[PDB]
């Protein structure tokens, strides 16, 4: 089962065009698009029942969606503005009024200039000896900075296995400059664990950058989507 | 809130005498301008003010198609409420809804509301935050759960903020320009 949304991350130059596709649950006839901007409440865009529009809400005249004969629907975005950079969710209830099932969501970011897209730089900081000695609980600092736009997912990797315990990833990216963001995450580790030199701690930052289709002028490597990570070994004494 | 646009929806049930009398009336500010009635010979969304008579002729088909659509759903709701409350399978009943958006002088939304009532007793209503509901009895909790699962809150608040205020602008311009 499960509903499918694609693409999950796209970067579009202001005034461009793009399409968002959605595959509802097999058999579901009702589909509806929701737009969620950064922090504000869920906006109702439009809904389609059985290939026909039922109720329209906040869908601008620029966006145009339609359900196909295989019940999937695509959203056509035209003349994109900077205010349009948001998250677009696709929910598909079986019938009208029935329980709906939401989607992963598409991350759309409209940029003022495609040249300003730049991958992050990840740096990993070992804990302070004063902290491990006075507290018996160490923290590893991971600083991803200098990226644009805010399309990152930071994850920790102890001994090659992803963990979610002890992590304190920042809620949102802190934009330092107009075209440069930064993120940080700290990893609580017991001082005995950090003192074992056989343990591998790697902080990994994934960057969803330019699509392959988007052209890029030379003089610099294309900021394609990529995950770069700064690793650090455990050390004793 | 100088200007407000409301809609009164009524689905009086009479069994054995046919099908429920269903009707919608809308009042721009406090004066009725459109009305729909099931117990008309060829029912149609009709204007009730001169400036509304000067509206688009496809507008009436859009609203009439929707009006007959609500009549069907409210026919099922009248049946569903008897199942929720274990009421008599025969006997008159009345569902009424008061939908509206009252806006200030600045055009920003001051309050948006929608209130369901069964036989004069409040059933459910959308909160001031336009995200939550307040059920009134055990059965309205069943309805609240349905709208929470279906996401009806996101749809209704989008109608109250965007659709209802935008069309109040259009109605207000029509009325005051010629009246």
């Amino acid at each position: 089962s499960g509903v499918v949304q694609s693409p999950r991350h796209i970067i579009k130059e202001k005034g461009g065009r793009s399409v968002l596709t959605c595959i509802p649950i097999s058999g579901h006839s009702n589909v509806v698009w929701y737009q969620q901007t950064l922090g504000k409440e869920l906006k109702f865009l439009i809904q389609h029942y059985e290939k026909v529009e039922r109720d329209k809400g906040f869908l601008p005249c620029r966006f145009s969606v339609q359900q196909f004969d295989d019940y999937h629907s695509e959203m056509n975005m035209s003349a994109l503005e900077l205010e349009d950079s948001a998250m677009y969710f696709c929910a598909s209830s079986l019938r009208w009024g029935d329980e709906q099932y939401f989607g992963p969501g598409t991350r759309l970011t409209v940029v003022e200039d495609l040249r300003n897209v730049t991958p992050p730089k990840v740096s990993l900081r070992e804990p302070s000896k004063a902290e491990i000695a006075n507290k018996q609980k160490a923290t590893l600092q991971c600083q991803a900075r200098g990226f644009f736009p805010d399309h990152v997912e930071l994850s920790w990797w102890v001994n090659g296995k992803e963990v979610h315990s002890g992590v304190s990833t920042d809620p949102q990216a802190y934009k330092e400059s107009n075209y440069s963001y930064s993120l940080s995450s700290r990893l609580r580790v017991s001082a005995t664990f950090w003192h074992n030199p056989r343990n591998h701690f790697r902080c990994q930052v994934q960057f969803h950058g330019l699509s392959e289709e988007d052209k890029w002028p030379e003089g610099s490597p294309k900021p394609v989507t990529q995950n770069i990570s700064a690793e650090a070994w455990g050390r004793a004494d | 809130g100088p200007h407000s646009l409301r809609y009164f929806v009524t689905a009086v049930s009479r069994p054995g005498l046919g099908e429920p009398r269903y009707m919608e009336v809308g009042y721009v500010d406090d004066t009725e301008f459109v009305r729909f009635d099931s117990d008309a010979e060829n029912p149609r969304y009709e204007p009730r003010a001169r400036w509304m008579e000067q509206e688009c002729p496809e507008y009436w088909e859009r609203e009439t198609q929707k009006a007959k659509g609500n009549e069907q759903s409210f026919r099922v709701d009248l049946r569903t409420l008897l199942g929720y409350y274990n009421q008599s399978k025969g006997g008159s009943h009345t569902i009424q809804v008061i939908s509206g958006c009252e806006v200030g002088s600045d055009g920003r939304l001051l309050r948006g509301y929608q209130q369901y009532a069964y036989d004069g007793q409040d059933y459910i209503a959308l909160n001031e935050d336009l995200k939550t509901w307040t059920a009134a009895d055990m059965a309205a909790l069943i309805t609240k759960h349905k709208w929470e699962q279906a996401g009806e809150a996101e749809r209704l608040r989008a109608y109250l903020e965007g659709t209802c205020v935008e069309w109040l602008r259009r109605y207000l311009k029509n009325g005051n320009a010629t009246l």
């Binding site: 009024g97 | 659509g69 309805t143 209802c164």
Partner: peptide, 8 residues
């Protein structure tokens, strides 16, 4: 315009 109610 008026809302399009879906059943309860």
């Amino acid at each position: 315009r008026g809302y399009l109610y879906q059943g309860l």
